[PDB]
């Protein structure tokens, strides 16, 4: 139940179906394409924390469940 909410532009996306066998980078790709996320000039808020380089763990390791939500923030006045 991927709940992508880009509160920077006020754009909410539809609920995407995720899987444990799904690569993190694959999801990130969709995020950078559809949502417009960026791993250089954007900050990814996972639940209540930031996706740091230390968190190289995949979805099935980060703790994905029935409710998966990704918040897009950062940019300028936030980072």
């Amino acid at each position: 139940d991927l709940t992508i909410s880009n509160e920077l532009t006020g754009e909410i996306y539809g609920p995407i179906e995720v899987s444990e066998d799904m690569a993190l980078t694959d999801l990130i790709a969709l995020l950078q394409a559809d949502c417009g996320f960026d791993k250089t000039k954007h900050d990814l808020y996972y639940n209540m924390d930031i996706l740091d380089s230390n968190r190289t763990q995949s979805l099935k390791e980060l703790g994905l469940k029935t409710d998966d939500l990704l918040l897009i923030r950062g940019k300028i006045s936030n980072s």
Partner: protein, 76 residues
């Protein structure tokens, strides 16, 4: 009818509503339970945003509908 509202914190809340219930009224029920002000409450159903001045039947919201409650946080 009963609906399911999932918050960003990963909480599944069930609310008792009617097909003729207004979105704003639903927000009031959320406010009464969670305490979060209606102004900071952004409800989205199936990717479609719900306006306070609209009803559940307007968005075809039926029983056991899964809604997403986004909170417009001023800080981050």
């Amino acid at each position: 009818m009963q609906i399911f509202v999932k918050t960003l914190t990963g909480k599944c809340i069930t609310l008792e509503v009617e097909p003729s219930d207004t979105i704003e009224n639903v927000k009031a029920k959320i406010q009464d339970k969670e305490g979060i002000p209606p102004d900071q409450q952004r409800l989205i159903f199936a990717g479609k945003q719900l306006e306070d001045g609209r009803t559940l039947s307007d968005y075809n919201i039926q029983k056991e509908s899964t809604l997403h409650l986004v909170l417009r946080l001023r800080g981050g």
